[PDB]
């Protein structure tokens, strides 16, 4: 059956297609992206069945439009820096102690 990109309009809402991190779907990405070193008198491989395009950690789910929409809805969660602390010079004055702590983001079960 035919891919669904034929049904996607040219002024559709892109973030709705890929709300979150998802793999490369050539049947869902409405682009003629080609990836690969061409053979002699050849072309880079098409997207359909292309393993290399599927191996990329794509940023289709994070577009400038999507990023702006997300940050517009996440503004509700933010507080404001106390305006008195205009720079460092007052910052080590009113709050002398500095406590540095580190956190790590790895990938795995633990």
């Amino acid at each position: 059956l035919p891919p669904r990109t034929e049904k996607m309009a040219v002024d559709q809402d892109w973030p709705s297609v890929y709300p979150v991190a998802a793999p490369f779907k050539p049947s869902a990405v409405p682009l003629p992206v080609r990836m690969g070193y061409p053979v002699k008198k050849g072309v880079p491989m098409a997207k359909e069945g292309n393993l290399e395009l599927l191996k990329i950690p794509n940023f289709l789910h994070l577009t400038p439009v999507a990023i702006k929409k997300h940050c517009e809805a996440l503004k509700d969660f933010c507080t404001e820096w106390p305006a008195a602390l205009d720079s460092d010079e007052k910052c080590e004055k009113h709050f002398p102690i500095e406590i540095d702590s580190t956190d790590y983001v790895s990938s795995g079960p633990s």
């Binding site: 709300p19 979150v20 991190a21 998802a22 956190d103 790590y104 983001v105």
Partner: protein, 122 residues
């Protein structure tokens, strides 16, 4: 006039069964997942995904212990010789244990108790 005004009965003014009743209530809003954000939300509610911002000591509290239990372990040396060479050996032992970040207080206390025993047989 609306159906909300008129005559009424006027009668009154102002275990396993419950478990399965609540489980049946859950089914009222049991729909298939509608997008990926919903999947992440369901997984994190189930406890599947990590909490973000990631906390490297999430789910671990060291039995609610405080630092003075980990740094000051010389109160477990009261039943030992107070001035002989076991005092030396055991004070230095507990100095070593107090610098161990991988053990909890309970293991350290059990280890000190094992030395208590071992010297007492000897």
């Amino acid at each position: 006039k609306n159906i909300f005004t008129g005559k009424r009965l006027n009668i009154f003014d102002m275990s396993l069964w419950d478990v399965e009743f609540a489980k049946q209530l859950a089914t009222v809003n049991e729909q298939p997942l509608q997008n990926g954000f919903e999947e992440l939300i369901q997984w994190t509610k189930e406890g599947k995904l990590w909490e973000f911002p990631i906390n490297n000591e999430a789910g671990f509290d060291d039995d609610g212990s405080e630092f003075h239990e980990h740094i000051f372990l010389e109160k477990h040396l009261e039943s030992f010789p107070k001035q002989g060479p076991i005092r030396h050996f055991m004070e230095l032992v507990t100095c070593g244990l107090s610098k161990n970040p991988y053990l909890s207080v309970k293991q350290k206390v059990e280890h000190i108790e094992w030395f208590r025993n071992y010297f007492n047989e000897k």
